Amino acid sequence: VSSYIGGEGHNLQEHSVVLIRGGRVKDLPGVRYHTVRGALDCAGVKDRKQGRSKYGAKKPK
Amino acid sequence: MVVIRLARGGAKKRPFYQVVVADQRRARDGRYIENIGFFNPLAKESEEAVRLNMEAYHAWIAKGAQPSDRVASLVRAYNKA
Amino acid sequence: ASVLTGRVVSDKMDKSITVLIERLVRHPLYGKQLRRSTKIKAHDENNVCQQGDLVRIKETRPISKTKAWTLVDVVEKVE
Amino acid sequence: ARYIGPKLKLSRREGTDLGLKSGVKPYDVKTKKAARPPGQHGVSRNKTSEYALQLREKQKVKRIYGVLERQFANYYKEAARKRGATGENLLAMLESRLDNVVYRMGFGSTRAEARQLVSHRTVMVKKAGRDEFVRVNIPSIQLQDGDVIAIQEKSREQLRIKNAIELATQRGIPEWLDVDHSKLQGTFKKAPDRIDLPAEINESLIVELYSK
Amino acid sequence: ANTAQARKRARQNTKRRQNSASQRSMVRTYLKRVDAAIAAKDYDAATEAYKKAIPVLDRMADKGIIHKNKAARRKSRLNKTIKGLQ
RNA sequence: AAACUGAAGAGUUUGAUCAUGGCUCAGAUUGAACGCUGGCGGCAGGCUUAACACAUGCAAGUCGAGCGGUAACAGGAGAAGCUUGCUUCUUGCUGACGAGCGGCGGACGGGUGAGUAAUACUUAGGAAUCUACCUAGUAGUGGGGGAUAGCUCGGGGAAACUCGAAUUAAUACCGCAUACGACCUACGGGAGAAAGGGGGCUCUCGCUAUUAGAUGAGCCUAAGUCGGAUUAGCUAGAUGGUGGGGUAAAGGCCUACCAUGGCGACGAUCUGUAGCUGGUCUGAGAGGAUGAUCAGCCACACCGGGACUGAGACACGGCCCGGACUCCUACGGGAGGCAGCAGUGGGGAAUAUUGGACAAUGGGGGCAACCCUGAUCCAGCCAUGCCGCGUGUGUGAAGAAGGCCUUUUGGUUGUAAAGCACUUUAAGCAGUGAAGAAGACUCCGUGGUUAAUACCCACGGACGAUGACAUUAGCUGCAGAAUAAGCACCGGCUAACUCUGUGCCAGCAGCCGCGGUAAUACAGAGGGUGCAAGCGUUAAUCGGAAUUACUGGGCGUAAAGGGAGCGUAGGUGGCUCGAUAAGUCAGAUGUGAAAUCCCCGGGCUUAACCUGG
């Protein structure tokens, strides 16, 4: 199945293990899932601040 | 044989016992033939700690059920009280 | 005991009779009764009743594998 | 939990005084706000809808009584369970809470101070038919009729209690509550009636909000 | 058997099985003689074999290898055929 | 008295309209997972997938008051090398127990839902049954014998163990006599039982026959019970009958023969799926979905099959045969089943400690002492759900400073802060301290008992042996704000708006949709909104959806009248007078387990929770 990588920038490549959740992308035909950022190997968004939990970004200290 | 015994209900560290007539083989919390009384270990003086049905207990004694020792002592205390 | 009255559909079997019972059952959702007929097998020791007769039967210990009923009485004879 | 942020901003958002701060001076002079909604924008277009009004009313009652949404939902469910008007029952429960009753008695100047004072176990509540006082650290305990309230011997000489009592005297004492100052003893003989409670608060909106 | 009590039960069961099997065959042999007498259709032989059979069934029934009702029913079923003959 | 309380819509087809019609959101919910974050307690919950393989430890023992005995441990007695205070061997003399014999238990407790569409379940009945232990009764418990394990001797094997000779005792085994019942009976009569132990001629536990109860299991009957007609015929031991056998018991359960029957559109057969139920969510209701936890029934115990024992098994931690897999082997042969409590590997998005005690309520054995009990009660871990509480409370202005916006000077953050005065719930320290305990044993009195004040049973007293939890629940003090706030969102549905950067790029989205140089829609700051030890996303179920419409929809044009007639089953059906009481209504009884839902009270400091009616 085909999944969408949300957020700005990602580290995914061939033979990377990812976690997949539901959720269709409206304007992408055949894309019916989303990639969970920060779950197994998909790193969170680097400089995310507002919606961090939706993109697997740790709380800046 | 049929043994009258306490059944453990209530909450953790707050035991409440239900006097029940049940087969010896069957478990304490399992099926019981009849319910005759409730026993409450920790209760206020105004509240009635022990309630039992004398007619049913006498009936079961005549029938031949073998009451447990704790229930027998509770019955003795209720009778004297 | 339980007594049921019904027509005897078949008397061909030796020392046996088959009786049809009509009962009304209310449909749970719709609430309208539907006629339901179930065949019950009974034991007739003298084969008194021919096919089409109305007979009364009662429950009894299984005489045979499929028969647990007996023909106590016969009420009406087909013309 | 209890709100830890500025008290005045809540009242400014609601647009009317919530009673969070004791009225030592006039509310208008103290803060000189609440004429307009808080924040930079202040007056704004696109007036709020009726559902927004219902939400505002619920937030008002919760903020006045220092009660979280979870407890408020439990109270509304109990009111609907109970016989009679649901809004009336819910208001009666909010009055029944211990912190509110001590604040009405005047032991605490404000509802938040009363809640802290009760949580600290200075206040003792005796239920009807009980000859021994019991210390309570839960301010949300419902009060049965005829209940008695005492200050602990350690807390008899508290300065804040003494300063609060005369503010309470200026504010007035409700009829249902009976307060003895010399012994610092308060009796909850009857629950407050809806007519006694403020008219301006609207119970119906809270009932509307929970009906989807 | 993972427990010594279970091993003991197994061996005791083996011994008890041997004894019960011997007694059971003792019952069957007498019943077989009565059946053979029935097959010959001789009243005297049937009566003699039935007289021999009688005590065995009750002795074994009390010991419990054969149930009391089974012994009674066998006596009442065999005597029926014997009576029917002649 | 009470249980009788409950119903919202919105965005979107059009230049615009109304209808219709789909799609989407607003709620509750859960054995829940993932992301940020995370102080504390109480009660619950914790492999939904691999019924996949299982290392390891424990989970079923007890009885010497049934018996022969003495392997160990302690003694006692003497033998005392006496080594004078070291000490050793003989004896079952004693408390006691290894092994062996014999009874009871192991069929309960505990686990799982693979199989099962009907030997399952629910519901209401029934007749042909057995039923250890238990309550009430009766009749007994006499006399004998040969065996045999341990023990000895010699072998065999690496082991698991096995073969020979001889031999000892029983509440082990087999006769004989007696027979209240009980069995057969052609009713004339026939046959069938057992064991002794212990306390001082007795009472006692046990045994044999059996009647009645109680409990438990087996059997049967009527109904209800998922999808599929693109599954219409299916059955030949098949339906019934007699003689015979088999069962504790009815029965094609089996068998010889005889007849041709048995089920089917009211759904038979054949397939997919699935344990059923009380209940659990959702919903105003009717309904829909579901069957974790707690409790009832069923089925299974690595796979297939067979039976032994026993009252009860075709037996989770028993037996036999075969099967695959793992292990040991000296190569011929042997051992195994965590779907018991923990625990390991593996699968997965995912679910825990290789813990304490029998102290309490139960179960097994015993006369008791006492032993076992991963049942049970507790304890460790997890925010996994619910409930409660805390992270402080007052007073505080030229409205400090800084950030942000701005018409560059004002506004906002904002009583927010600083200052100032208090307070110490929770956490931590020092103490204190209930309750869960039922009164064992022992002494004394009374009655029953008996030949007996012995013995035994019952009752009534005195007495203080018993606590894992535990360093307890609670109570009192010690110092000080000191130990503790985050998540999502702000175009509309929907509560919350402006800048800066970007420029159909980066990106957001649940729907309409935003992004092409002045973005309330992307990323960042300020501000604000909602929740708050939580907050969102995702997955699922119901709701909204009157969108399968019985309550409660439509069919001229939006989807929908069969091309028309005929007629089978089936559905419905004129007027009057009667019988009948099946449907219908009303009342009586039993049942519809307990819990859960609801109402009124009670107990935990409140709540969850428990609890009487």
PDB file of C-alpha atoms in Angstrom, chain D:
ATOM      1  CA  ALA D   1      -7.406  20.663  39.320  1.00  0.00           C
ATOM      2  CA  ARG D   2      -7.967  24.357  40.046  1.00  0.00           C
ATOM      3  CA  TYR D   3      -7.237  27.241  37.683  1.00  0.00           C
ATOM      4  CA  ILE D   4      -3.885  28.895  38.421  1.00  0.00           C
ATOM      5  CA  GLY D   5      -4.027  31.807  35.969  1.00  0.00           C
ATOM      6  CA  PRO D   6      -5.207  35.411  36.300  1.00  0.00           C
ATOM      7  CA  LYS D   7      -8.643  35.649  37.898  1.00  0.00           C
ATOM      8  CA  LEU D   8      -9.604  38.949  36.260  1.00  0.00           C
ATOM      9  CA  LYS D   9      -9.193  37.786  32.652  1.00  0.00           C
ATOM     10  CA  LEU D  10     -11.906  35.154  33.155  1.00  0.00           C
ATOM     11  CA  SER D  11     -14.344  37.768  34.444  1.00  0.00           C
ATOM     12  CA  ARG D  12     -13.374  40.108  31.607  1.00  0.00           C
ATOM     13  CA  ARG D  13     -14.089  37.402  29.027  1.00  0.00           C
ATOM     14  CA  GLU D  14     -17.440  36.676  30.654  1.00  0.00           C
ATOM     15  CA  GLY D  15     -18.154  40.420  30.788  1.00  0.00           C
ATOM     16  CA  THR D  16     -19.471  40.397  34.381  1.00  0.00           C
ATOM     17  CA  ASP D  17     -17.981  39.904  37.832  1.00  0.00           C
ATOM     18  CA  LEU D  18     -17.449  36.289  38.904  1.00  0.00           C
ATOM     19  CA  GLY D  19     -16.697  36.920  42.584  1.00  0.00           C
ATOM     20  CA  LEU D  20     -13.206  35.435  42.296  1.00  0.00           C
ATOM     21  CA  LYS D  21     -11.660  38.387  44.160  1.00  0.00           C
ATOM     22  CA  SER D  22     -12.999  39.645  47.475  1.00  0.00           C
ATOM     23  CA  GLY D  23     -14.722  43.000  47.149  1.00  0.00           C
ATOM     24  CA  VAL D  24     -12.516  45.132  49.387  1.00  0.00           C
ATOM     25  CA  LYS D  25     -12.828  47.963  46.836  1.00  0.00           C
ATOM     26  CA  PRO D  26     -15.203  48.413  43.897  1.00  0.00           C
ATOM     27  CA  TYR D  27     -14.652  45.914  41.111  1.00  0.00           C
ATOM     28  CA  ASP D  28     -14.578  48.650  38.471  1.00  0.00           C
ATOM     29  CA  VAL D  29     -11.897  50.727  40.209  1.00  0.00           C
ATOM     30  CA  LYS D  30      -9.804  47.684  41.108  1.00  0.00           C
ATOM     31  CA  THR D  31      -9.175  46.522  37.527  1.00  0.00           C
ATOM     32  CA  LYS D  32     -10.596  49.138  35.083  1.00  0.00           C
ATOM     33  CA  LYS D  33     -11.310  46.421  32.519  1.00  0.00           C
ATOM     34  CA  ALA D  34     -14.170  44.076  31.512  1.00  0.00           C
ATOM     35  CA  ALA D  35     -15.923  46.833  29.545  1.00  0.00           C
ATOM     36  CA  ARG D  36     -14.503  45.100  26.444  1.00  0.00           C
ATOM     37  CA  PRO D  37     -13.437  41.465  25.942  1.00  0.00           C
ATOM     38  CA  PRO D  38      -9.809  40.686  26.821  1.00  0.00           C
ATOM     39  CA  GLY D  39      -6.932  40.508  24.388  1.00  0.00           C
ATOM     40  CA  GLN D  40      -5.593  42.886  21.786  1.00  0.00           C
ATOM     41  CA  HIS D  41      -8.637  42.700  19.524  1.00  0.00           C
ATOM     42  CA  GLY D  42     -11.236  43.811  22.062  1.00  0.00           C
ATOM     43  CA  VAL D  43     -14.432  44.752  20.254  1.00  0.00           C
ATOM     44  CA  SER D  44     -14.866  42.525  17.208  1.00  0.00           C
ATOM     45  CA  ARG D  45     -17.325  41.797  14.413  1.00  0.00           C
ATOM     46  CA  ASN D  46     -19.085  38.519  13.528  1.00  0.00           C
ATOM     47  CA  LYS D  47     -21.127  38.320  16.710  1.00  0.00           C
ATOM     48  CA  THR D  48     -21.175  34.989  18.539  1.00  0.00           C
ATOM     49  CA  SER D  49     -23.824  32.322  17.925  1.00  0.00           C
ATOM     50  CA  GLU D  50     -26.312  30.810  20.376  1.00  0.00           C
ATOM     51  CA  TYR D  51     -24.108  27.760  20.937  1.00  0.00           C
ATOM     52  CA  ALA D  52     -21.322  30.187  21.815  1.00  0.00           C
ATOM     53  CA  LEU D  53     -23.696  31.850  24.293  1.00  0.00           C
ATOM     54  CA  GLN D  54     -24.464  28.475  25.901  1.00  0.00           C
ATOM     55  CA  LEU D  55     -20.744  27.715  26.113  1.00  0.00           C
ATOM     56  CA  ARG D  56     -20.155  31.122  27.695  1.00  0.00           C
ATOM     57  CA  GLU D  57     -22.839  30.476  30.319  1.00  0.00           C
ATOM     58  CA  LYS D  58     -21.381  27.079  31.228  1.00  0.00           C
ATOM     59  CA  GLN D  59     -17.889  28.557  31.437  1.00  0.00           C
ATOM     60  CA  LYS D  60     -19.277  31.309  33.682  1.00  0.00           C
ATOM     61  CA  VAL D  61     -20.786  28.879  36.165  1.00  0.00           C
ATOM     62  CA  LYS D  62     -17.717  26.637  36.186  1.00  0.00           C
ATOM     63  CA  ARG D  63     -15.409  29.619  36.679  1.00  0.00           C
ATOM     64  CA  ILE D  64     -17.548  31.089  39.468  1.00  0.00           C
ATOM     65  CA  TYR D  65     -17.594  27.794  41.360  1.00  0.00           C
ATOM     66  CA  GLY D  66     -14.022  26.681  40.591  1.00  0.00           C
ATOM     67  CA  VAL D  67     -15.246  23.332  39.239  1.00  0.00           C
ATOM     68  CA  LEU D  68     -13.676  21.508  36.299  1.00  0.00           C
ATOM     69  CA  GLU D  69     -15.651  20.253  33.311  1.00  0.00           C
ATOM     70  CA  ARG D  70     -15.440  16.613  34.412  1.00  0.00           C
ATOM     71  CA  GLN D  71     -16.979  17.347  37.812  1.00  0.00           C
ATOM     72  CA  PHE D  72     -19.482  19.686  36.160  1.00  0.00           C
ATOM     73  CA  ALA D  73     -20.590  16.921  33.788  1.00  0.00           C
ATOM     74  CA  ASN D  74     -20.971  14.506  36.698  1.00  0.00           C
ATOM     75  CA  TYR D  75     -23.072  17.118  38.514  1.00  0.00           C
ATOM     76  CA  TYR D  76     -25.267  17.722  35.453  1.00  0.00           C
ATOM     77  CA  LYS D  77     -25.779  13.974  35.031  1.00  0.00           C
ATOM     78  CA  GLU D  78     -26.777  13.696  38.690  1.00  0.00           C
ATOM     79  CA  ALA D  79     -29.164  16.635  38.288  1.00  0.00           C
ATOM     80  CA  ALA D  80     -30.864  14.970  35.317  1.00  0.00           C
ATOM     81  CA  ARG D  81     -31.030  11.737  37.328  1.00  0.00           C
ATOM     82  CA  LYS D  82     -32.633  13.542  40.276  1.00  0.00           C
ATOM     83  CA  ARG D  83     -36.281  14.541  40.293  1.00  0.00           C
ATOM     84  CA  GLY D  84     -37.186  18.116  39.415  1.00  0.00           C
ATOM     85  CA  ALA D  85     -35.542  20.789  37.320  1.00  0.00           C
ATOM     86  CA  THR D  86     -32.058  19.825  36.161  1.00  0.00           C
ATOM     87  CA  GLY D  87     -30.648  23.349  36.243  1.00  0.00           C
ATOM     88  CA  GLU D  88     -32.111  23.942  39.693  1.00  0.00           C
ATOM     89  CA  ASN D  89     -30.629  20.677  40.966  1.00  0.00           C
ATOM     90  CA  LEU D  90     -27.213  21.466  39.454  1.00  0.00           C
ATOM     91  CA  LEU D  91     -27.172  24.944  40.991  1.00  0.00           C
ATOM     92  CA  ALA D  92     -28.199  23.406  44.315  1.00  0.00           C
ATOM     93  CA  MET D  93     -25.264  20.977  44.157  1.00  0.00           C
ATOM     94  CA  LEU D  94     -22.798  23.749  43.299  1.00  0.00           C
ATOM     95  CA  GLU D  95     -24.075  25.603  46.363  1.00  0.00           C
ATOM     96  CA  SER D  96     -23.879  22.400  48.415  1.00  0.00           C
ATOM     97  CA  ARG D  97     -20.128  22.039  47.858  1.00  0.00           C
ATOM     98  CA  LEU D  98     -18.150  22.669  51.044  1.00  0.00           C
ATOM     99  CA  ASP D  99     -15.858  25.408  49.707  1.00  0.00           C
ATOM    100  CA  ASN D 100     -18.818  27.489  48.562  1.00  0.00           C
ATOM    101  CA  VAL D 101     -20.648  27.131  51.878  1.00  0.00           C
ATOM    102  CA  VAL D 102     -17.606  28.173  53.907  1.00  0.00           C
ATOM    103  CA  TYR D 103     -17.114  31.132  51.560  1.00  0.00           C
ATOM    104  CA  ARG D 104     -20.758  32.159  52.051  1.00  0.00           C
ATOM    105  CA  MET D 105     -20.268  31.839  55.814  1.00  0.00           C
ATOM    106  CA  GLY D 106     -17.269  34.155  55.448  1.00  0.00           C
ATOM    107  CA  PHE D 107     -14.502  31.985  56.893  1.00  0.00           C
ATOM    108  CA  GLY D 108     -12.768  32.476  53.536  1.00  0.00           C
ATOM    109  CA  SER D 109     -12.879  35.804  51.729  1.00  0.00           C
ATOM    110  CA  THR D 110     -12.854  34.192  48.266  1.00  0.00           C
ATOM    111  CA  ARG D 111     -13.956  30.833  46.888  1.00  0.00           C
ATOM    112  CA  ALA D 112     -10.392  29.866  45.939  1.00  0.00           C
ATOM    113  CA  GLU D 113      -9.125  30.757  49.416  1.00  0.00           C
ATOM    114  CA  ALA D 114     -12.009  28.738  50.863  1.00  0.00           C
ATOM    115  CA  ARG D 115     -11.125  25.765  48.654  1.00  0.00           C
ATOM    116  CA  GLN D 116      -7.488  25.861  49.768  1.00  0.00           C
ATOM    117  CA  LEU D 117      -8.510  26.341  53.408  1.00  0.00           C
ATOM    118  CA  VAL D 118     -10.793  23.298  53.232  1.00  0.00           C
ATOM    119  CA  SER D 119      -8.246  21.161  51.379  1.00  0.00           C
ATOM    120  CA  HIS D 120      -5.812  21.967  54.192  1.00  0.00           C
ATOM    121  CA  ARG D 121      -8.283  20.378  56.723  1.00  0.00           C
ATOM    122  CA  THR D 122      -8.688  23.465  58.918  1.00  0.00           C
ATOM    123  CA  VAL D 123     -12.456  23.136  58.417  1.00  0.00           C
ATOM    124  CA  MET D 124     -14.314  20.208  60.023  1.00  0.00           C
ATOM    125  CA  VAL D 125     -17.734  19.069  58.792  1.00  0.00           C
ATOM    126  CA  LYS D 126     -20.130  17.134  61.036  1.00  0.00           C
ATOM    127  CA  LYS D 127     -22.855  15.189  59.259  1.00  0.00           C
ATOM    128  CA  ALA D 128     -26.347  15.065  60.727  1.00  0.00           C
ATOM    129  CA  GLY D 129     -26.619  12.547  63.549  1.00  0.00           C
ATOM    130  CA  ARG D 130     -22.872  12.466  64.306  1.00  0.00           C
ATOM    131  CA  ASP D 131     -21.588  13.485  67.735  1.00  0.00           C
ATOM    132  CA  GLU D 132     -17.888  13.650  66.750  1.00  0.00           C
ATOM    133  CA  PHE D 133     -16.335  16.121  64.331  1.00  0.00           C
ATOM    134  CA  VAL D 134     -14.373  14.703  61.385  1.00  0.00           C
ATOM    135  CA  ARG D 135     -11.661  16.568  59.485  1.00  0.00           C
ATOM    136  CA  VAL D 136     -12.145  16.642  55.706  1.00  0.00           C
ATOM    137  CA  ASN D 137      -9.556  17.443  53.018  1.00  0.00           C
ATOM    138  CA  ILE D 138     -12.019  17.244  50.076  1.00  0.00           C
ATOM    139  CA  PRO D 139     -13.763  20.605  49.439  1.00  0.00           C
ATOM    140  CA  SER D 140     -16.218  19.033  46.964  1.00  0.00           C
ATOM    141  CA  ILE D 141     -18.131  17.058  49.607  1.00  0.00           C
ATOM    142  CA  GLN D 142     -21.881  17.473  49.281  1.00  0.00           C
ATOM    143  CA  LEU D 143     -23.595  18.663  52.467  1.00  0.00           C
ATOM    144  CA  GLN D 144     -26.700  17.031  53.903  1.00  0.00           C
ATOM    145  CA  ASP D 145     -29.248  19.205  55.660  1.00  0.00           C
ATOM    146  CA  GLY D 146     -28.401  20.264  59.202  1.00  0.00           C
ATOM    147  CA  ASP D 147     -24.653  19.758  58.798  1.00  0.00           C
ATOM    148  CA  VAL D 148     -22.326  21.636  61.164  1.00  0.00           C
ATOM    149  CA  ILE D 149     -19.012  23.355  60.355  1.00  0.00           C
ATOM    150  CA  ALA D 150     -16.190  24.077  62.829  1.00  0.00           C
ATOM    151  CA  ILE D 151     -12.708  25.566  62.674  1.00  0.00           C
ATOM    152  CA  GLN D 152      -9.907  23.459  64.146  1.00  0.00           C
ATOM    153  CA  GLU D 153      -8.269  24.626  67.363  1.00  0.00           C
ATOM    154  CA  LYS D 154      -5.044  25.329  65.449  1.00  0.00           C
ATOM    155  CA  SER D 155      -6.959  27.469  62.924  1.00  0.00           C
ATOM    156  CA  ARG D 156      -9.101  29.438  65.393  1.00  0.00           C
ATOM    157  CA  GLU D 157      -6.815  32.502  65.429  1.00  0.00           C
ATOM    158  CA  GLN D 158      -6.110  32.714  61.680  1.00  0.00           C
ATOM    159  CA  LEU D 159      -5.631  36.313  60.553  1.00  0.00           C
ATOM    160  CA  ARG D 160      -7.124  35.737  57.103  1.00  0.00           C
ATOM    161  CA  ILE D 161     -10.277  34.255  58.631  1.00  0.00           C
ATOM    162  CA  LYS D 162     -10.704  37.309  60.867  1.00  0.00           C
ATOM    163  CA  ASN D 163     -10.182  39.711  57.962  1.00  0.00           C
ATOM    164  CA  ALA D 164     -12.589  37.653  55.834  1.00  0.00           C
ATOM    165  CA  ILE D 165     -15.380  37.715  58.419  1.00  0.00           C
ATOM    166  CA  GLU D 166     -15.984  41.471  58.256  1.00  0.00           C
ATOM    167  CA  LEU D 167     -15.919  41.463  54.445  1.00  0.00           C
ATOM    168  CA  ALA D 168     -18.517  38.698  54.714  1.00  0.00           C
ATOM    169  CA  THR D 169     -20.542  40.891  57.073  1.00  0.00           C
ATOM    170  CA  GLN D 170     -20.452  43.783  54.587  1.00  0.00           C
ATOM    171  CA  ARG D 171     -21.463  41.410  51.785  1.00  0.00           C
ATOM    172  CA  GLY D 172     -24.289  39.905  53.846  1.00  0.00           C
ATOM    173  CA  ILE D 173     -25.061  36.429  55.175  1.00  0.00           C
ATOM    174  CA  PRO D 174     -27.538  34.138  53.370  1.00  0.00           C
ATOM    175  CA  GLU D 175     -30.685  33.161  55.239  1.00  0.00           C
ATOM    176  CA  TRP D 176     -30.163  29.404  54.930  1.00  0.00           C
ATOM    177  CA  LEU D 177     -26.681  29.536  56.465  1.00  0.00           C
ATOM    178  CA  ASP D 178     -26.446  30.256  60.194  1.00  0.00           C
ATOM    179  CA  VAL D 179     -23.100  31.596  61.419  1.00  0.00           C
ATOM    180  CA  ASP D 180     -21.883  32.147  64.989  1.00  0.00           C
ATOM    181  CA  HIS D 181     -18.796  34.366  64.902  1.00  0.00           C
ATOM    182  CA  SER D 182     -17.706  33.931  68.520  1.00  0.00           C
ATOM    183  CA  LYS D 183     -17.535  30.138  68.182  1.00  0.00           C
ATOM    184  CA  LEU D 184     -16.812  30.236  64.422  1.00  0.00           C
ATOM    185  CA  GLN D 185     -19.609  27.696  63.901  1.00  0.00           C
ATOM    186  CA  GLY D 186     -21.745  27.379  60.774  1.00  0.00           C
ATOM    187  CA  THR D 187     -24.932  25.352  60.188  1.00  0.00           C
ATOM    188  CA  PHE D 188     -26.360  24.334  56.785  1.00  0.00           C
ATOM    189  CA  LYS D 189     -30.005  23.956  57.765  1.00  0.00           C
ATOM    190  CA  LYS D 190     -31.524  24.175  54.265  1.00  0.00           C
ATOM    191  CA  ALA D 191     -30.349  24.179  50.668  1.00  0.00           C
ATOM    192  CA  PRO D 192     -30.576  27.489  48.767  1.00  0.00           C
ATOM    193  CA  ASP D 193     -33.690  28.015  46.684  1.00  0.00           C
ATOM    194  CA  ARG D 194     -33.551  29.039  43.033  1.00  0.00           C
ATOM    195  CA  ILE D 195     -35.379  32.281  43.837  1.00  0.00           C
ATOM    196  CA  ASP D 196     -32.747  32.971  46.495  1.00  0.00           C
ATOM    197  CA  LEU D 197     -29.937  32.294  44.024  1.00  0.00           C
ATOM    198  CA  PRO D 198     -28.971  35.065  41.573  1.00  0.00           C
ATOM    199  CA  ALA D 199     -31.540  35.637  38.841  1.00  0.00           C
ATOM    200  CA  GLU D 200     -29.009  36.744  36.223  1.00  0.00           C
ATOM    201  CA  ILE D 201     -27.450  33.278  35.932  1.00  0.00           C
ATOM    202  CA  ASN D 202     -29.370  31.225  33.354  1.00  0.00           C
ATOM    203  CA  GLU D 203     -29.764  27.532  34.141  1.00  0.00           C
ATOM    204  CA  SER D 204     -31.533  26.639  30.894  1.00  0.00           C
ATOM    205  CA  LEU D 205     -28.501  27.329  28.695  1.00  0.00           C
ATOM    206  CA  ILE D 206     -26.377  24.768  30.550  1.00  0.00           C
ATOM    207  CA  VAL D 207     -29.146  22.196  30.050  1.00  0.00           C
ATOM    208  CA  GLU D 208     -29.299  23.084  26.350  1.00  0.00           C
ATOM    209  CA  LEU D 209     -25.543  22.677  25.939  1.00  0.00           C
ATOM    210  CA  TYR D 210     -25.494  19.060  27.139  1.00  0.00           C
ATOM    211  CA  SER D 211     -28.355  17.941  24.850  1.00  0.00           C
ATOM    212  CA  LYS D 212     -26.202  17.936  21.695  1.00  0.00           C
TER     213      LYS D 212
END
